[model samples]
Target: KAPTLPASIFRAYDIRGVVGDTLTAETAYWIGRAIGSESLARGEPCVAVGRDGRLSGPELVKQLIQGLVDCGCQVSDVGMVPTPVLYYAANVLEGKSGVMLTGAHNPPDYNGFKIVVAGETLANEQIQALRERIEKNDLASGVGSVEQVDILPRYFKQIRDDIAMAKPMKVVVDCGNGVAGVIAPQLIEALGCSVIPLYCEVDGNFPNHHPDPGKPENLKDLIAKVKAENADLGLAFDGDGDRVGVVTNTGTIIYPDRLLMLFAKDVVSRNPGADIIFDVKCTRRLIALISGYGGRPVMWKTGHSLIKKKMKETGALLAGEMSGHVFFKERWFGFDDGIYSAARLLEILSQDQRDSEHVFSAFPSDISTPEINITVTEDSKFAIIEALQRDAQWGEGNITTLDGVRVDYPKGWGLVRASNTTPVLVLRFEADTEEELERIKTVFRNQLKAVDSSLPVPF
Candidate 1:
């Protein structure tokens, strides 16, 4: 019999699709066969599996495990955990492969698989290869067994060992009804903080609000909770608990790039001249700040998996993306784990008597947009970026082709990159002042419009 899978589920990074119409137990079974065969070919007979708090998680995971067993791969079901937990399992579980069934920050009806082969993220060509193999029915055949294991205790202990706070503080956590709701409160309480949990229930419907904290609208409830509770700090996680959003007592949202500045400074303080990687969408001030601290700053393409690969290749101690994905290789594995990042943030906050607002406000830069997106077809978006690269003028600083077109200026810089996950051109600008930032944005906007007047520009 032919395996059933919707073509839309095969994406650039992972297999994600709408429930029932695009994803089902039968489809999951086939995906398991593909993953199992790949692992076996690489001499790995065992694979670790985990899922999020989605309503369909158990059923999908069950079918996935059956497919793995059919392919002769032993399965360690790390049941109902965050994506990073699964990644950690693959890294430490004496296994060479892991598969996390999650939709990440996607909508409730969506679900996907994030595969790690030998501790590396499988994406791009690797993801497409899985589909090809499954279509050809190239799968290993035999019987294997499944073992259920609870990894939360060990995972929590590992995080506790890596970063510790000197004093207890009042912290507000808004899980936004994602998988993090299941575990963040427990972890925070164990760290000796007065934990105020908001929306800490496993509701895949996201009743309170959208799980994405990157959007300002989604953080409204979290900000209100922080101010109402009079907490020292607040943390919010995405749907699958991979990205983090933070708020201070003063109700200020600390953007990810600024947060990276703090993280990079701390890393450079210890390991002088250590390499630090930031995504292209990050503010230019962050790169300059890193260099000012005597650290080598490398700008790379966006995406958590891509950043992790770069961290391993460059041996960077730390790397971050503007989307709140932070990778720490200094004292832990090079993967974006929001739980670990929250602990590190607390560690930094505990080192000083200053409150979260004061610490973040001290290193203030000019006004900047939080990743403005312009809708365009995927095929036309790349061509548009290529056109801009040719037409736009690079005045003072160098222009980087690391991901897309990033024009560095004297006062600030502007970036135009095609989003890997969406069909839009992601634009961001930063400068020393609001006026200067607007001036930089004007230059990029005018040039972009000059290339194609029909381009839909969104503020």
Candidate 2:
């Protein structure tokens, strides 16, 4: 019989849970078996495995590879690397399917799996189906081989060959002791930038701070470093290095939405009438900017896998999320790679011949609050979002339910969506003026209060 697994660990986009609790070596083995069985059935009998700098990674990955090998799937062990490196290996190696063992911006005790099969990242029901496969003990059987491969040099060569900056600039890169430290600094330096490394050591403990760069508080150190060194820019990468957070020379946080504007202008100018996709949490100004650039602006759901799938579907050249997952399909692979995005940003900054601050400041800025997360139970979070989607009433506003409840008023807009990776309701409000921001916040407050009068709503 297969090992028992917690269904909750199977999230919408990936598999994640506390290491010692919901996730264990046995759990990893069973997941591998299920994935291998599926892969064999799909005529892709090879799997590439990689892990982040988490303490629990070694044991979990060992068992996962063993399970894959036992189930008649060839395994290529990519060793300690960022999630993107594993993605690179999968694309270049014979195995087009891979799994990344990473906590991915979660607390240190947490670990999970980001799965891709036949070059497609699984999501939603596809993820749930893995759980069902494991529970039923429906696994393939045969002896398979395991091979050790180092793809980092190839990954570096690919990026270095593709990205060329007009001139070298000073850059501060903070890896937060996550897996990105293994490649980010060297890659940036190779791309003609002088690197100032911060916490670049690969320590699974993440002793300095959490690996999530989306939270402003987590970027405090990187912001300070950029200012002290008077660098051209600062870049921070999440635990597994799929997302990025950028800081300007003046210690200003260039939120991914605004950064997307810069990228959109560059890409759309080259390829007119291209599709540009952004998540629901992004600034509404993106629509006008893309339209003004003669590009079609598409707002999709807020997940990396979902965004990548959308890019393939819409043939979009550029896409970004408020959480800092940016995809450049024009000149690079469509996967979200923080290191590559930083290089692209540097490339643009180098040619402009202006201070990073003035270049980024050219984009329109509005009064907006960073994403505010309100904690709730895993079960209750989705319920609350459903209640709002089904019942909320906003006076004289246009409602968008593509992902959650986003009500656009004449002056501004407000969004309330359940975070897929965590048990929280993510909220963001933006407007032309402070009064409009407050007014929109009040509207959301009233609507949320109607759903649960006793619940705490953080505006």
Candidate 3:
């Protein structure tokens, strides 16, 4: 019997769609079957599965496990967990495959899957291959059983055991009603921090704010809370609790690129000359900083799964994205775990004895633009990037084909990449000064407009 699936559900990084419309329990069942078949082919019958706090998560997990069982794949259900925990299970567990049911930073109505097979991120051409296999009824036969396990205690203990803060510091955490609300406070408190929690309730509706900590709009409440509390720092997490956003007491958003600088310094101090990966959208300063610290920097595509896979391949100690996804492969597993990142931040802060703002303020570089998102049709978004890449005049500095079109300039750099999960283009510019930042943005904007006039220029 053929496993049923919607073509739209097969995405670049993982399967994602609007629940009840594009994604349903029936679809999840087929996805499970496809995953199970793949596992069986690799002679790995056991698979771990988990979901975030979305309203549809329970039903989806149930159907997904049923499909896996139907296809002869035994399932270990890590019930209601963050995305990183599922990734941890995949990495540490013997079978080396797992699936997470999460919408990530998407809207409340959306849901999706992030899968790992044998420690490699299933992405690009491989994601489509899963759909083709299911449509062709290539699923394995025989039923497998499901066993539910509570792994949060183990996960918490692991992180707590790995990192320790020298002194207690007051910190504010804004979970934005996402899955992190369920775990952030406990994790921080365990790490010896006096935690001031805001909106730290697991609400699928995301009543306080959108769970996307990457956007400044979504972080307004967090910033305000940090200021009001006068805490040492503030940390925010995305929907599935994989990405992290940080703000200092001064109300400055310490973008992930800069955070990576700090992490790079710490990692390099211990393991000098180790490879540290950053996505294309990150600032050139990050790469330079990594190199300055006697560490190797590798620029890769802008996806957590892709970065994690790259880290494993390169034996990189750390990997991060501009969108707040940080992977620590040095002292921890190579997965973007927001909770783990927060603990690491605290540990580093404690060691320096300087507040977060003071530490970040010392690393002065340039006026930069945070990610600017503009809506475009999914069909035409990649074409727009491709056209821009073709027309871009190569000049001094360096040109990278790592993700999209990233051209580095002498004083700064600009990037234009179509997002894999959304119908939008992600633009970012960094420069030595405010004027240079605007100049770089203008040049990139003009080039992008030349490629597609329909794109709304939001500078």
Candidate 4:
């Protein structure tokens, strides 16, 4: 008999864990059965299945398909594609719930599933419901079928019909052997670019390198190739391609928050005085830029599900996270799609009749720390955030606990929050100057200690 489903894998936004013991082919079947049984109750017995480039994908994908079918879901197997492609299929595929088997920017040994039902990513209590169904063996029994379809052309057409380039530009795309390797080359060249493909070949083992672009070291190749080829710019898609990392021609790593700033200016101009939402971890520069452009900047909690829900509530035209998730309701599905966002990025840049670097370089600026994490016990991590908030003594500042606690100083902002994904305290700081940066980080550093005296707070 299969080992019991690991409770730790069911996360706030998605289900994730190492393969084999925690997440297995058997677990995939049950997850699908559970999800499909729910769909059967809703009168729509359909689900979309997609997988990423982890070695375990093929098995997990097959088992997941069997699971959904066992619950009487008409499983439209989109085959191996990025997370965004799965979401696109679900949205357009006649009220279908979607499940993707992906590691989602994690290490090679890791694998997981992202479940979207009724147009919402299952989160928190919604996630817990699945396990309850599994435990109760409440799955429905019925007959279902599977269909194999090619969604690449449809996705390409959606982006192609919506965007076109005025003049040709040279671009370097590094997929890092993820599933995006298959589509990004085809996708980018369709946007009228000279395509320079690096690690664009699909490899589950990620022999060339790991598929995560968020890590600075992982992007060294993308940056180097841009300079070597004198390309107009470089784009790096994470393991699942829902998140994108960009580099200007001059090899400047453009983080997501700043990328959002560029998209904000374009979007706000089209829809005047719209609500622009961003996570607390984003730059203060972004907030000021939105206000400068006559748009209302709203700071909200972090996490994709939370942000998506907030977006629905506020009707925000555009929303983004510092971790490179950009959700566009401007013209597209409003779900985070890195490839689609990149298409829009090119669409916007192409109109300027200038190098891509020059267009993006004009986004506002600030001195900021890369995300810093303080490792601590999962038990005591959140308490540290509270202690920081409850005893926060930053002089004359605005404090908000929308997610964790963010202290907005006269010249900068410092945020300390418990990471929903790991046992660590996530800290990020931004300021007008280095001294201000120090002042902000140091203030948090001092308070982070009260909860755990031995905890090392890396400055």
lDDT of 3 by residue, 1-459 (tens): 764567988987789999989998888888888888887887888899999999899899899889889988778888888898888888766668899999988888899989877656677788888898887887787878888877888888898898878977888888878888778899899888899888888988887788888788888988888888888888888888888889998889988889998999999999989999989877788888889989999988987667777888899999998667898989887778998998998899888878888999888567777578989897998988888777866456588867788888889998888887699988888899888888788888788778867668988
Note the Cα lDDT for every prediction shown. Answer: 0.85, 0.89, 0.85, 0.85
Q: Let me know the TM-score candidate 2 reaches against the reference structure.
A: 0.91
Segments in model 1 whose C-alpha atoms lie over 4 Å from true places: 375-379, 420-423, 453-459
Answer with 1 or 3, whichever has the higher lDDT: 1
Model 3 root-mean-square deviation: 2.8
Models 1 onward score TM values of 0.95, 0.91, 0.90, 0.93
Pairwise TM-score winner, candidates 1 and 3? 1
- The backbone clash count of each candidate, in order, is 0, 0, 0, 0
lDDT of 3: 0.85
Residue 162 lDDT in candidate 2: 81
Q: Of 2 and 3, which scores higher on lDDT?
A: 2
Q: Distance (Å) between predicted and true CA of 56, model 4?
A: 2.8
What lDDT does model 4 reach? 0.85
The pairs that clash in candidate 4 are none
Model 1, span 1-459: residue lDDT tens: 446466678887788987887898789999998988888888888899999988788999999988888999999999999888988888888786999999888788888898877656677788888888887877789899898888988999998877768877899888888999778888888888899888889888877787888887888988888899889998989988888899999899987888998999999999999999988888788888999999999988887667878888999999998778898888888888898888888899888799999999988577777668899997888988898777776557678877888878778888888876678888888778888888878778788888888777775
- How displaced is residue 151 in candidate 2, in Å? 1.1
All-Cα superposition RMSD per candidate: 1.9, 2.6, 2.8, 2.2
